[PDB]
């Protein structure tokens, strides 16, 4: 199920999305496309709820991290019951 | 993963805690080491008391454990950056979740494989008509 | 530490479970009362539990229409109440059986007999019979109220 | 006079209190 | 048909009722007041039981005595 | 409630059948169907 | 270094800073200075709206609790200045633009009028003939009645009151300036809650009613006794002539012959000439007895002055509020009130929530008390004045209550410390808020089904031609048995449980039908099945408003959905479409929904009041005594169905507002249409979303770019929260203005 | 549905879910589908559907009844 | 059986309750308690 979280090559490696994410969906991995030498990654999208905090945080001209809401699970619906 | 240790925080009880899901579906655990007995905000409402030494707490959701973790690492005199978060299944199986490779994700780390990476800009996604009658959306290709 | 005068403690000794042990939620009286209702009374097979629950419910379901339904001001007041109660118990039996049909498709647990397909069908059967009988017996009491009064007053001695 | 109809079924509510307290005392003495 | 008030204060309303209520209020105040002697203004030479433990205690318990006494007078006055 | 049209005994039982039996049965079938957890 | 007085510490608990904030006009020319985020510069039009949204948010402006307290103190001064200007304008318009003396000479055959419209574009039609050749707008504030009760006779007295009100406003303004800029009290000064409370109970409330009792005994009562006897206002001596001639006071009240000796010697009974306890209403004017009110204010002065002594300040005797709080803790509540004294002395929003709740409740109490115990002369004759004051105080109370919920939530977000609240009342309520809110939800559903559901059942039964199956006094009766019993107890109080009371406290509980002039002042208000149903509707709507607002407060910190909501703030749109969508989770949004529901509740309350008073109370009495009510006693059979309320209440009584054109009440029909318009307008903001409007602004901005007229402050659509604020504000304004026009036109047209 | 948006209802439904899971006798029964608040789009659509049904039925009843009672 | 005293409907149902329902319930509870565990 889960949502989809894509990271595009306009990433500047500021990591603000990872710090904003309240469910630990994102990581920083080494890259060579930007000065910061790091790119955001979404290795745990099965826990992603889709609150869009990462997108709120992204500074690049139109987001370099994009959350497309998809199939809804109890983890993705933020359910505690 | 193995067994989890730690003392339950001093607390009298809330209505905001675990429900039938915890036994039927899944649960989450957060462990942390505290320097003293100090009061902290319970993510399910109320104030609880963490004990000096090890503390294990069971919560209903991963986001609740992560909110407690941010509170531990941001609101305490000696900061607590020691908490570990696990997913607990009713079969007794425990799954280590956070922090993945022993390092917080905000900072880079070697041996991490990029996932969700797209080798193009947003404006370089294909047109939906070029992919209709497949099952894919322009970000999935 | 000479401080446990508190009556509201953690539910079942687990303060992190979404519940609180209170004089209503977990006191000796409420526990021994609800636990010995036909729904939870140990040593009871599902059909007997359903029989008891249905008896109670069908007995008391006569009143509302009997005293307030449209037939209350006719010569068929008790018959109208009875008919309403029987239809209500039939719809409730259909609901019970449908619930059982949908909730117990998968693997049959081994905890309690009531929480299985067979057990729930037995509970529904018991409920149907007990409810129809309780409604009919409360109807029969109301229709023969004079003999009940004469009995409890010794009028027939 | 004669006791009021409403008066007779008013002492029973007050009797509910010693009933509760006797229940509590019995359960405590059983301990 | 109103409440009649003794008609004149003379000897009955005063002393026999008012002073007694003030005295018994002073007793209950000396018995039950917590901070007995620590007001901004202190009391003159103690001696008896009037300014023995602070002007504040004395004034407060005399106010309460007049409350008790007014109640007593108006009540017994019918 | 009556009817002078032909076969006026038909609404007598069809109105309960359309208002009570038809909805009860169709809702029950759709209920057991949407809750069916047979794989697929 | 402005004007420096000596000291004025008086060896007290006073502690001020001599001159912390200097006076200057430069920060006037820099709009947005109080917020760091706005002092930079407006880049988008959002900056503009924010400039108004955070003006009084002193917490987000500075972190010094002392500076916030000083700001609040000086703003209180400025607010009192504004209210003084308003009241002085009221007295000035009564002095130089009202028919107060002509009304005083013949109150029955004239209508209270102030404010003369200037004859232009045809608006001169609004100067309707109110009596005695006077043409203007009829006022429903009831200022003339308060003035006759006070003892006013000449316009020059009202003019002196207006001049004094302007001077008092200047005083309050200067005091605010002086106490924020020059001598600014330290934080330690505001935290003397025992001192403040002793003073407010003793000096503010007690001395106020003491001085007003003095004025009523010396000025109000004698002038009103001479007016009720018909001595005419031109022949009654000035108020001071009764102080200069104590014989004139003894001739009206012989008790004044014996002097102050009954007071000092406790011989109070002889004071029966002006200190009375009659209970009912004045037969000549229909208001309360001014001697009863003087005695009332006297006893209230006594009680409040006495109460101003419980708390301890500098002299040892008194009470420590922290002690009384910490003492109260039982086996169900752990530590009870341990920590409440600390939050009620360092958090402004806590005091504000408590005070708003109690003040709104008190204003509702004031409406419900002033309608049935009309305290002013000739008030009950004017059904427009009565209805207007009732609905106004109702609305004020409801708004204050919604604000109370708001600031409870704000406290929870901003000033809640879990270390300072461990196993106390607040902690345990947060620990079982799920239980609380779930049960309140169930009670709300039960009330909705068992109040409005009764109306729906009655509509369906009546439509089917089955009146015998309805809920009504003539079918399935739902008698308000307990309220009827309490009414009967009230009726029997004088002479029995109230020996020294001559009459009942309010004739709405029962008794004779007090009637002044052709109209009925007040009569018994019977209660039946319709009253039962309306009252349980009131219960339902009040419980739903409480549910919304209490849920907003209890979950402002967190929920199972949003566990870190406290970090998001009091006021924020959402936390994303994820988790299924999290729109309106903030405390602010709960206030936003509670606004609509309070509007719903109070609309029903005022509709109930209007219809019940027009059906079963107000009307015309005959020389025989026959009572023909305004709408002929139609409440019992019509107010039991919704169609009855739509037809016999709304549709029927709306006939005056719609036919008001070409007459003096035409502005009321105009404002009727205007309120409908603004209500409809609000639905655009409430039903839509910011994204569409911003995208449309994109094309409009492109058209501006095409002709090079694009503004540097970029147009941005209203923010989500702002969209809702605009929506709710216009909804409330439109609906309330509609019913304001409806009520005023209907009540002024029925004579 | 149009005015009041979703998160407030999801929290209320969570209180109701807790109320059910802790009420004995009712505890014997459990939902086959987890109760949740209506989605955002679903809310818009359901609110518009009520708006439109009420719109059309109100005006139809008015038009028909007025023209029939007056007979043109 | 009747009664000119007020609430004469109370013994009507209260005599069977004290004589049948209450004794049956108390005896059943005490019987279950006597034969508990095993
Ligand atoms: C709007 C709701 C509503 C309405 C209108 C009614 C209406 C009515 N109810 Mg009901 N009820 C309701 C809700 C309602 N109820 C609810 C919510 C409950 C709780 C679940 C009950 C439970 C209840 C009970 C238990 C009974 C009623 C009964 C009645 C009827 C009593 C009036 C009468 O006919 O006098 C006459 C009343 C009697 C003759 C009492 C019956 C006396 C029998 C013989 C018992 C004797 C006691 C003793 C233990 C004997 C047991 C023998 C055993 C040892 C073998 C009446 C028509 C009574 C009834 O159905 O009449 C038969 C009755 O027994 N109600
Ligand atoms: C779609 C057309 C249509 C509609 C809207 C109605 C409407 C109605 N009919 Mg009628 N009926 C119809 C066709 C229709 N009829 C036809 C063709 C026949 C001859 C076979 C009948 C024979 C019939 C009888 C004998 C009676 C009614 C009666 C009624 C009334 C009560 C409902 C009922 O009991 O129906 C019952 C209907 C049937 C037993 C026959 C089925 C009707 C058609 C063939 C099926 C319609 C399927 C429909 C197109 C599916 C689309 C549904 C959509 C929401 C997806 C109701 C106002 C009762 C009455 O007169 O009230 C006083 C009554 O007793 N109908
Ligand atoms: C308490 C608030 C209050 C309210 C809302 C009113 C309301 C009103 N007054 Mg009143 N008045 C008040 C206080 C108030 N007054 C006070 C305190 C005084 C004593 C100083 C007066 C003395 C007064 C007089 C003498 C008159 C009014 C008049 C009026 C009416 C016309 C207003 C007008 O056009 O002015 C004129 C406004 C302008 C020319 C524009 C103002 C300039 C703006 C603010 C500048 C903004 C750009 C920078 C109006 C309905 C008139 C009236 O009743 O007509 C018969 C009139 O004659 N008032
Ligand atoms: C008996 C002494 C006394 C009195 C009269 C007041 C009165 C008042 N206080 Mg204050 N207060 C006092 C003691 C007193 N306080 C003390 C000792 C403290 C320290 C703990 C405080 C601290 C305190 C705070 C923090 C605040 C107040 C505020 C207020 C005002 C709010 C109530 C209101 O608006 O009603 C109606 C208002 C009026 C009727 C205004 C007329 C009253 C004038 C200004 C003063 C009276 C004149 C003077 C006594 C001489 C006239 C009487 C004489 C001729 C017989 C009010 C006028 C609030 C405020 O600032 O309001 C602006 C506020 O925030 N008080
Ligand atoms: C703030 C409230 C207030 C104020 C300012 C006053 C002020 C005054 N009162 Mg008053 N009074 C008050 C409260 C107040 N009183 C209350 C609560 C009561 C009810 C117990 C009275 C009942 C009262 C009486 C009975 C009398 C006064 C009198 C007087 C005047 C004193 C003249 C005098 O004693 O010479 C001596 C007078 C004679 C020898 C005759 C004086 C101007 C006296 C007066 O004549 O009024 C003008 C008078 O006898 N008052
Ligand atoms: C369930 C308990 C309860 C209830 C029912 C109330 C209700 C009320 N309180 Mg109270 N309060 C409580 C608990 C309670 N409070 C406790 C435990 C404390 C001790 C900390 C206080 C101390 C307090 C004070 C000091 C005052 C009130 C006042 C009031 C009244 C305000 C009316 C109003 O807003 O109109 C208009 C407002 C006024 C006429 C005066 C406004 C006074 C200021 C502006 C508010 C208080 C400032 C605050 C103490 C600043 C310090 C807090 C922090 C910054 C350190 C109101 C009816 C006020 C009052 O007048 O009492 C009669 C007031 O002076 N409360
Ligand atoms: C007429 C318009 C309307 C209606 C009917 C409702 C309905 C309701 N609102 Mg709501 N609301 C409205 C307007 C309306 N709202 C608007 C405009 C807003 C925006 C401000 C809100 C925002 C709002 C909030 C924030 C809240 C509510 C709440 C509630 C519920 C209160 C509980 C209750 O009353 O029990 C039930 C009552 C009813 C369901 C009314 C209809 C009952 C009829 C008479 C019986 C129907 C018979 C049968 C079922 C028919 C079946 C047909 C068959 C074919 C199956 C209730 C269901 C509160 C709540 O949830 O309380 C628990 C709450 O929190 N409303
Ligand atoms: C206001 C007073 C409150 C009391 C309730 C009043 C009416 C309600 C009756 C409900 C009872 C609940 C039944 C289930 C209670 C129940 O079955 O409990 C359970 C237990 C046997 O069941 P188990 O042990 O298997 O169940 C344990 C768990 O399932 C508990 O839930 O029974 C007993 O404990 C013995 C009963 C006590 C015997 C009491 C002695 C009484 C004799 C003395 C009487 C004196 C009378 C003097 C005055 C005349
Ligand atoms: C017609 C009135 C109908 C209500 C009667 C039934 C009451 C319902 C709840 C029973 C307990 C509350 C009464 C004891 C009052 C009481 O304080 O009991 C005592 C106990 C706490 O008392 P403590 O011993 O802790 O006292 C020390 C205090 O200083 C605590 O700070 O309260 C509780 O156990 C918590 C539950 C109260 C919350 C229950 C309220 C539920 C809302 C129901 C609203 C009904 C409307 C009333 C109309 C005005
Ligand atoms: C106890 C109690 C209570 C109360 C309750 C109520 C209010 C009620 C109930 C009541 C009821 C609910 C009763 C009942 C009755 C029933 C019956 C009595 C039954 C029956 C049946 C029979 C007898 C049989 C029949 C039949 C059959 C089945 C077979 C065939 C046919 C016939 C008909 C024969 C409470 C919880 C509060 C508390 C505690 C105690
Ligand atoms: C219409 C609309 C807009 C567009 C509205 C805008 C851009 C507001 C336009 C305001 C203009 C610029 C000012 C006109 C009103 C003045 C405030 C009135 C005072 C002017 C004085 C001269 C009197 C939104 O941005 C929006 C956002 C979220 C939910 C709903 C809506 C919504 O409905
Ligand atoms: S916020 Fe955007 S630019 Fe910054 S690291 Fe994350 S994806 Fe890259
Ligand atoms: Ca009938
Ligand atoms: Cl009607």
- Domain borders along chain F are 1-40
Q: How far is CA E36 from CA E28, E30, G306, G311, in A?
A: 12, 8, 20, 15
**Phi, psi angles (nearest 5°) of residue G126:** -70, -10
Quickly list DSSP for G263-331.
HHTT-GGGGGGTS----SB-TTTSSB-HHHHHHHHHHHHHHHHHHTTSS-SSSS-S--HHHHHHH---T
How remote is the CA of residue G332 from the centroid of ligand 9, in Å?
10
Cα E24 to Cα E29: distance, rounded to the nearest angstrom? 8
Tell me how close the Cα of E36 comes to any Cα of chain G, in angstroms. 7
**CB burial class (10 A; 0-12, 13-18, 19+) of residue B92?**
exposed
DSSP G471: B
The whole-angstrom separation of Cα G699 and Cα G710 is: 12
Contact G325, G337 (CB under 8 A): yes
Q: How many CB atoms lie within 10 A of CB B125?
A: 18
- Give the C-alpha separation, G705 to G700, whole Å: 9
The answer to whether residues G338 and G328 touch, using CB atoms and an 8 Å cutoff, is no
**Residue the block writes with tokens 């620990």:** G431
Across the interface, of B16, B42, B47, the residue whose CB is closest to G560 is B16
Check the CA dihedral C146-C151-C152-D1 and report its sign: positive
**Residue B94 burial (CB < 10 Å; 0-12/13-18/19+)?**
middle
Q: Give the residue extent of every domain in chain B.
A: 1-141
Instruction: Give the rounded distance of the alpha carbon of G34 from its chain centre.
Output: 31
Residue C147 to residues G179, G442, I12: CA-CA distances in angstroms? Answer: 88, 42, 14
Q: Does H5 touch chain A (CB under 8 A)?
A: no
Residue F24 contacts C, CB cutoff 8 Å:
yes
Look at strands B117-118 and A2-8 and give their pairing: parallel
Query: Resolution, rounded to a tenth of an Å?
Result: 2.5
Distance separating the N- and C-terminal Cα atoms of chain D: 47
Cβ-Cβ contacts under 8 Å for I25 (sequence gap 6 or more): none
Residue G266 and residue E73: Cβ atoms within 8 Å?
A: yes
How far, in Å, is the centroid of ligand 13 from the Cα of G598?
39
Give the DSSP per-residue string, G641-670: SHHHIIIIIIIHHTHHHHT-TTSTTHHHHH
**Are G331 and C70 within 8 A, CB to CB?**
no
Find the domain containing C60 and state its range: 1-157
G494 ligand 9 Cβ < 6 A: no
Is G588:G406 a contact under the CB 8 Å cutoff? yes
Residues in chain B within 8 Å Cβ distance of C15: 8, 11-14, 17
Distance CA H45, CA E7 (A): 82
CA angle centred on B92, ends B86 and B97, rounded to 5°: 15
Does the CB of A50 have a partner CB in chain G at under 8 Å?
Answer: yes
Measured by CA distance, the residue closest to atom 20 of ligand 3 is G89
- Interchain CB distance below 8 Å, G584 and H19: no
Phi/psi at G583 (5° precision): -75, 135
In our burial notation (b when 16+ CB lie closer than 10 A, e otherwise), range G140-168 reads: bebbbbbbbbbbbbebebbeebbeebbeb
* CA A10–ligand 12 middle distance (angstroms): 8
G434 has a chain C CB within 8 A of its CB = yes
Query: For F11, how many CA atoms within 13 A lie in the half-sphere containing its CB?
Result: 7
Q: Residues of G comprising the binding site for [4Fe-4S] cluster?
A: 574, 583
- What the block records as the tokens of G617 is 């109370």
Whether residue C98 and residue F36 make contact (CB cut-off 8 A), yes or no, is: no
The closest CB to that of G419, out of B12, B39, B44, belongs to: B39
The response to whether residue C68 sits with its C-beta less than 6 Å from ligand 1 reads: yes
* List of domains in chain G: 1-751 (1.20.1130.10)
Backbone angles phi, psi at B49, to 5 degrees: -120, 115
Say how far apart CA B27 and CA B17 lie, in whole Å: 11
User: How far from chain centre, in Å, is Cα G217?
Assistant: 29
Structure tokens of G20?
């912390």
Percent of chain G as helix, strand, coil, to the nearest 5:
60, 5, 35
Tokens of E14: 């005063």
Chains that touch F (3 or more CB pairs under 8 A): C
Sign (positive/negative) of CA torsion A65, A70, A73, A79? positive
Please state, in angstroms and rounded to a whole number, the distance separating the CA atoms of residues B59 and E35: 50
Q: Which of F28, F36, F38 sits opposite C98 (nearest CB)?
A: F28
Residue G42 to residues G33, G47, G572, G715, G726, Cα–Cα distance (Å): 12, 5, 21, 11, 21
Reading the block at residue A24, the tokens are 């630990």
* SS3 category, F27: helix
I13 close to C (CB below 8 A): yes
Q: Which residues pair with G522 in a beta bridge?
A: G514
Strand order in the sheet with B117-118: A65-71, A2-8, B117-118
Q: Rounded to a whole number, what is the distance in Å from the CA of E15 to chain G's nearest CA?
A: 13
DSSP string, B82-124: --EEEEE-TTS-EEEEESTTSS-TTS--TTPPP-SEESS-GGG
Neighbours of G295 (CB within 10 A): 21
H/E stretch holding E45: none
Question: Between chain D and chain A, are at least 3 CB pairs below 8 A?
Answer: no
Write the secondary structure of chain C as one string of H (helix), E (strand) and C (coil): CCCCCCCCEEHHHCCCECCEECCCCCCHHHHHHHCCCCCCCCCCCHHHHHHHHHHHHHHHCCHHHHHHCHHHHCCCHHHHHHHHHHHHHHHHHHHHHHHHHHHCCCCCCCCCHHHCHHHHHHHHHHHHHHHHHHHHHHHHHHHCHHHHHHHHCCCCC
A24–B107 C-beta distance less than 8 A: no
Rounded CA-CA distance G245/G242 in Å is 5
The string of DSSP codes covering H19-68 is: HHHTSTTGGG---SS---PPPHHHHHHHHHHHHHHHHHHHHHHHHHHHHH
How far is residue G354 from each of residues G358, G668, H71, measured CA to CA in Å? 6, 37, 61
Distance G204 CA to ligand 4 centre (A): 7
Any contact of G with A, at least 3 CB pairs below 8 A? yes
Residues within 8 A of B (CB atoms), C 12-71 only:
14-21
Query: Which of 3.40.50.720, 3.90.470.20, 3.30.70.20, 3.40.630.30 would CATH assign to domain A1-81?
Result: 3.30.70.20
Minimum distance, in Å, between the CA of residue A55 and any CA atom of chain H: 19
Taking a contact as any Cβ pair under 8 Å apart, which residues of chain E between 8 and 67 contact chain G? 8-9, 13, 33-41, 54-57, 60, 63, 67
Give me the DSSP letters along chain A.
-EEEEEEETT-----HHHHH-TT---EEEE-SSSTT-EEEE-TTGGG-----HHHHH--SSS-SEEEEEEE--TTTTT---
Contact criterion met (CB below 8 Å) for G564 and B43: yes
Tokens coding G70? 């000083």
- The answer to whether B62 contacts A30, with C-beta atoms less than 8 Å apart, is no
Q: Please check whether the domain covering B1-141 is classified as CATH 3.30.70.260.
A: no
Tokens representing E22 are: 């003030």
Ligand 12 binding pocket includes A25 (Cβ within 6 Å): no
* Three-state secondary-structure class, residue G509: coil
Q: Do the Cβ atoms of A3 and A76 come closer than 8 Å?
A: yes
I13–C154: do the CB atoms touch at under 8 Å?
A: no
Residue in this structure with the two tokens 């759709």, named with its chain if needed: F30
User: How far does residue G374's CA lie from ligand 12's centre (Å)?
Assistant: 69
Closest CA to G248 of G221, G212, G274, G222: G222
**Whole-angstrom distance, CA of residue G161 vs CA of residue G100:** 15
Atom of ligand 4 nearest to the CA of G195: 20
How far is the C-alpha of G91 from the C-alpha of G97, rounded, in Å? 10
Distance set, CA C106 to CA C100, C102, C115, C116, F14 (Å): 12, 9, 12, 10, 38
CB neighbours of G219 closer than 8 A, spacing ≥ 6? Answer: G150, G151, G239, G242
Q: What stretch of H or E contains G131?
A: strand G128-131
Chains E and I touch (3+ CB pairs under 8 A): no
If one residue of G210, G216, G240, G259 were mutated to test the ligand 5 pocket, choosing by the most ligand atoms within 8 A of its CB, it would be: G259
Q: Is E59 helix (H, G, I), strand (E, B) or coil?
A: helix
Q: Give the ligand 11 atom nearest the CA of G689.
A: 29
Neighbours of G318 (CB within 10 A): 20
* Number of Cβ atoms within 10 Å of the Cβ of G336: 18
CA B100 to chain centre: 10
**Chains adjacent to B (≥3 CB pairs closer than 8 angstroms):** A, C, G, H
Q: Which strand (E) or helix (H) includes residue G45?
A: none
Helix (H) or strand (E) holding B29, with range, is strand B27-34
- Smallest Cα–Cα separation from G711: which of G53, G49, G52, G42? G42
Token pair belonging to G446: 């039960």
CA distances from G114 to B68, G96, G140, G406 (A): 64, 9, 10, 37
- Cα G349 to ligand 6 centre (Å): 11
- Contact, B21 vs A81, CB < 8 A? yes
Q: Are G643 and G458 in contact (CB under 8 A)?
A: no
Supply the angle between the helices E18-32 and E55-76 in degrees, to the nearest 10: 140
Strand ranges (E), G139-267: 184-185
Nearest CA to G252 out of G263, G266, G241 is that of: G241
Inter-CA distances, G424 with A58, G335, G392, G427, Å: 42, 5, 39, 5
A80 touches chain H (CB under 8 A): yes
Tokens representing G17? 């800073």
Q: At what angle do helices C77-103 and C46-60 cross, to 10 degrees?
A: 150
G498 three-class SS: strand
H runs (alpha helix) in G415-464: 425-431, 433-449, 452-463
E19-58 per-residue burial string, b: 16 or more CB within 10 A, e: under 16: eebbeebbeebeeebeebeebeeebeeeeeeebbbbbbbb
Give dist(CA G111, CA G747) in Å, integer. 13
How many angstroms separate the CA atoms of G260 and G128, rounded? 51
Q: Could you give the CA distance from residue H11 to residue G559 in angstroms, rounded to a whole number?
A: 7
| DSSP 8-state secondary structure symbol assigned to residue B40 | E
Tokens 């629950």 map to which residue?
Answer: C53
G627: DSSP letter = E
Q: Tokens standing for B84?
A: 């570990």
Say if the Cβ atoms of A81 and H36 lie within 8 Å: no
CB contact under 8 A, I5 and D2: yes
**Cα(G89)–Cα(G78) distance, rounded to whole angstroms?**
17
H11 touches chain G (CB under 8 A): yes
Query: CA G66, G67, G69, G70 torsion: positive or negative?
Result: positive
Does chain C touch chain H (at least 3 C-beta pairs within 8 Å)? yes
Q: Is the dihedral of CA F14, F16, F21, F24 positive or negative?
A: positive
**Binding site members of G:** 574, 583, 676, 684, 692-693
Q: What's the DSSP call for residue E37?
A: S
By the 8 A CB rule, do B43 and B67 touch?
yes
Adjacency order of strands within the sheet including G113-114 = G113-114, G134-138, G128-131
The rounded distance, in Å, linking the Cα atoms of G155 and G98 is: 9
Is G194 in contact with G307 (CB distance < 8 Å)?
A: no
Q: What Å distances lie between residue B127 and A68, B130, B141, G198, CA to CA? A: 16, 5, 11, 76
CA-CA distance, B121 to B102, in Å (whole number)?
32
CA G245-G246-G248 angle, to 5 degrees, is: 70
Per the CB < 8 Å rule, is A81 touching B19? Answer: yes
Query: C82 and C102 in contact (C-beta within 8 Å)?
Result: no
Q: Which of B11, B18, B57 sits opposite C18 (nearest CB)?
A: B18
The CA distance from G561 to B64, in Å, is: 9
Cβ A30–B110 below 8 Å, yes or no? yes
Contacting residues for E63 by C-beta, under 8 A, at least 6 apart: G309
Cis peptide before B99 (omega within 30 of 0): yes
Look at F38 and C105 and tell me if their CB atoms are within 8 Å. Answer: yes
For residue G166, the number of C-alpha atoms closer than 13 Å in the C-beta half-sphere is: 8
Kindly state if the Cβ of A28 falls inside 6 Å of ligand 12: no
CA atoms within 13 A on the CB side of C61: 23
Across chain G, which distance is largest between two alpha carbons, in Å? Answer: 92
- Rounded to whole angstroms, how far apart are CA atoms G318 and G315? 8
**What ranges in D1-31 are assigned the alpha helix state H?**
5-30
In this structure, chain G runs to a length of 751
Residue G172: what are its φ and ψ, rounded to 5°? -60, -40
A14 is in an annotated binding site: yes
C29 to chain I nearest CA, in Å? 14
The answer to whether residues B101 and B94 touch, using CB atoms and an 8 Å cutoff, is no
């Amino acid at each position: 199920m889960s949502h989809s979280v894509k990271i595009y090559d306009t990433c500047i490696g500021c990591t603000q999305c990872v710090r904003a994410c309240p469910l630990d969906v994102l990581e920083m991995v080494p890259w060579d496309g930007c000065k910061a030498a790091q790119i955001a990654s979404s290795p745990r999208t099965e826990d992603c709820v889709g609150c869009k905090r990462c997108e709120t945080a992204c500074p690049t001209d139109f987001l370099s991290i994009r959350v497309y809401l998809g199939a809804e699970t109890t983890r993705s619906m933020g359910l505690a019951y | 993963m193995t067994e989890l240790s730690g003392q339950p925080p001093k607390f009298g009880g809330s209505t905001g805690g675990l429900l039938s899901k915890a036994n039927r579906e899944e649960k989450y655990a957060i462990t942390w080491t505290s320097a003293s007995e100090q009061v902290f905000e319970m993510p399910t409402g109320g104030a609880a008391i963490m004990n000096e030494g090890e503390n294990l707490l069971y919560l209903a959701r991963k986001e609740q454990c992560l909110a407690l973790g941010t509170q531990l690492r941001t609101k305490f005199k000696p900061k607590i950056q020691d908490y570990k978060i696990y997913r607990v299944y009713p079969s007794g199986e425990v799954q280590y979740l956070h922090p993945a490779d022993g390092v917080f994700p905000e900072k880079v780390n070697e041996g991490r494989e990029a996932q969700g990476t797209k080798t193009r800009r947003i404006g370089q996604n294909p047109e939906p008509v070029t992919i209709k009658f497949s099952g894919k959306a322009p970000y999935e290709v | 530490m000479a401080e446990s005068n508190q009556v509201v403690q953690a539910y079942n000794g687990d303060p992190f479970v979404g519940h609180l042990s209170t004089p209503i939620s977990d006191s000796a009286f409420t526990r021994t009362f609800i636990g010995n209702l036909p729904a939870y009374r140990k040593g009871l097979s599902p059909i007997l539990r359903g029989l008891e629950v249905g008896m109670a419910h069908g007995y008391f379901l006569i009143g509302p229409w009997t005293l307030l339904g449209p037939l209350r001001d006719s010569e068929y007041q008790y018959i109208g109440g009875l008919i309403g109660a029987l239809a209500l118990i039939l719809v409730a039996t259909a609901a019970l059986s449908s619930y059982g049909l949908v909730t117990f498709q998968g693997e049959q647990g081994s905890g309690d007999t009531l929480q299985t397909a067979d057990g729930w069908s037995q509970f529904a059967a018991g409920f149907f019979v007990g409810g129809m009988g309780g409604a009919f017996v409360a109807y029969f009491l109301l229709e023969n109220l004079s003999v009940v009064d004469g009995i409890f007053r010794g009028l027939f001695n | 006079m004669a006791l009021s109809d409403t008066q007779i079924l008013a002492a029973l509510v007050v009797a509910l209190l010693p009933a509760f307290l006797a229940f509590r005392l019995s359960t405590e003495l059983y301990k | 048909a109103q409440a009649s008030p003794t008609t004149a204060g003379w000897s009955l309303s005063v002393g026999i009722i008012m002073c007694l209520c003030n005295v018994f209020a002073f007793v209950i105040g000396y018995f039950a007041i917590q901070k007995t002697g620590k007001g901004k203004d202190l009391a003159l030479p103690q001696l008896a039981s009037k300014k023995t433990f602070g002007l504040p205690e004395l004034l407060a318990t005399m106010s309460f005595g007049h409350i008790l006494g007014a109640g007593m007078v108006l009540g017994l006055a019918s | 409630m009556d009817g002078s049209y032909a076969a006026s005994y038909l609404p007598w039982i069809l109105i309960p059948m359309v208002g009570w039996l038809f909805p009860a049965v169709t809702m029950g079938l759709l209920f057991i169907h949407i809750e069916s957890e047979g794989e697929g | 270094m402005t004007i420096s007085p000596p000291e004025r510490e008086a060896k007290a608990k006073v502690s001020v800073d001599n001159n912390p904030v200097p006076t200057s006009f430069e920060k006037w020319g820099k709009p947005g200075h109080f917020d760091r985020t706005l002092a930079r510069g407006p880049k988008t039009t959002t900056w503009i709206w924010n400039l108004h949204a955070n003006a009084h948010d002193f917490d987000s402006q500075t972190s010094d609790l002392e500076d916030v307290s000083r700001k609040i103190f000086s703003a209180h001064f400025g607010h009192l200045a504004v209210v003084f200007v308003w009241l002085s304008g009221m007295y000035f318009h009564g002095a130089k633009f009202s028919n107060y003396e002509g009304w005083l000479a013949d109150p029955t055959h004239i209508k209270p009028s102030a404010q003369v419209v200037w004859p232009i574009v045809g608006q001169g039609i609004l100067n309707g003939d109110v009596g005695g050749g006077f043409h203007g707008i009829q006022i429903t504030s009831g200022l003339f009645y308060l003035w006759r009760a006070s003892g006013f006779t000449d316009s020059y007295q009202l003019y002196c009151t207006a001049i004094g009100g302007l001077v008092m406003a200047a005083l309050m303004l200067f005091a605010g300036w002086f106490h924020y800029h020059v001598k600014a009290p330290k934080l330690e000064w505001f935290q003397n809650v025992e001192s403040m409370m002793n003073h407010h109970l003793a000096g503010l409330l007690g001395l106020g009613s003491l001085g007003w009792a003095g004025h009523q005994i010396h000025v109000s009562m004698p002038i009103n006794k001479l007016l009720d006897a018909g001595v005419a206002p031109k022949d009654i001596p000035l108020p001071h002539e009764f102080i200069l001639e104590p014989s004139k006071m003894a001739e009206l009240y012989p008790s004044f012959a014996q002097g102050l000796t009954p007071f000092f010697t406790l011989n109070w009974g002889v004071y029966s000439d002006f200190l009375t306890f009659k209970g009912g209403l004045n037969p000549v004017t229909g208001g309360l007895w001014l001697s009863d009110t003087a005695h009332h204010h006297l006893a209230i002065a006594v009680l409040f002055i006495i109460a101003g002594h419980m708390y301890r300040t500098n002299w040892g005797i008194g009470h420590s509020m922290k002690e009384i709080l910490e003492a109260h803790k039982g086996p169900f509540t752990g530590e009870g009130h341990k920590g409440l004294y600390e939050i009620l002395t360092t958090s402004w929003h806590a005091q504000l929530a408590i005070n708003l709740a109690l003040l709104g409740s008190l204003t509702i109490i004031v409406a419900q008390h002033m309608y049935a115990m009309p305290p002013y002369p000739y008030q009950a004759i004017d059904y427009a004045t009565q209805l207007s004051l009732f609905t106004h105080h109702m609305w004020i109370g409801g708004f204050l209550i919604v604000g109370a919920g708001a600031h409870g939530a704000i406290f929870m977000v901003r000033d809640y410390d879990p270390a300072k609240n461990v196993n106390n009342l607040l902690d345990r309520m947060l620990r079982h808020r799920d239980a609380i809110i779930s049960h309140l939800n169930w009670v709300c559903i039960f009330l909705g089904f068992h109040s409005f559901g009764l109306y729906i059942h009655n509509d369906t039964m009546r439509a089917l031609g089955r009146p015998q199956d309805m809920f009504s006094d003539t079918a399935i009766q739902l008698q308000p048995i307990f309220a009827q019993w309490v009414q009967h107890l009230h009726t029997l109080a004088p002479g029995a449980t109230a020996p020294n009371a001559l009459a009942t406290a309010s004739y709405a509980f029962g008794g004779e039908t007090i009637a002044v002039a052709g109209k009925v002042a007040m009569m018994p208000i019977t209660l039946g099945t319709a009253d039962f149903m309306v009252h349980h509707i009131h219960a339902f709507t009040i419980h739903v408003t409480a549910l919304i607002l209490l849920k907003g407060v209890l979950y402002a910190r967190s929920s199972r959905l949003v566990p870190d909501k406290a970090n998001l703030g009091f006021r924020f749109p959402c936390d994303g479409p994820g988790r299924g969508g999290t729109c309106q989770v903030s405390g602010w949004d709960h206030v936003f929904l509670g606004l609509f529901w309070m509007y719903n509740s109070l609309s029903i309350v005022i509709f109930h009041f209007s219809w019940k008073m027009q059906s079963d109370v107000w009307g015309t009495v005959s020389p025989d005594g026959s009572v023909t009510h305004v709408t002929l006693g139609n409440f019992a059979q019509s107010a039991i169905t919704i169609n009855g309320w739509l037809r016999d209440f709304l549709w029927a009584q709306a006939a005056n507002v719609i036919n008001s054109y070409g007459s003096a009440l035409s502005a009321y029909g105009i404002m009727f249409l205007a309120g409908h318009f603004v209500f409809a307008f609000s639905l655009m903001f409430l039903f839509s979303g910011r994204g569409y409007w911003q995208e449309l602004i994109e094309s409009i901005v492109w058209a501006h770019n095409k002709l090079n007229v694009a503004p540097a402050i970029q147009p941005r659509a209203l923010s989500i929260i702002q969209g809702r604020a605009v929506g709710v504000a216009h909804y409330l304004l439109g609906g309330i203005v509609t019913t304001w026009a409806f009520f005023l036109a209907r009540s002024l047209s029925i004579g | 549905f149009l005015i009041s948006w979703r998160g407030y209802w999801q929290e209320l439904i969570e209180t109701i879910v807790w109320a059910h899971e802790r009420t004995p006798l009712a505890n014997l029964v459990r939902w086959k589908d987890k109760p949740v608040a209506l989605s955002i789009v679903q809310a818009r659509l359901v609110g518009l559907a009520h708006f439109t049904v009420g719109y059309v039925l109100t005006y139809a009843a008015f038009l028909i009844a007025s023209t029939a009672g007056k007979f043109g």
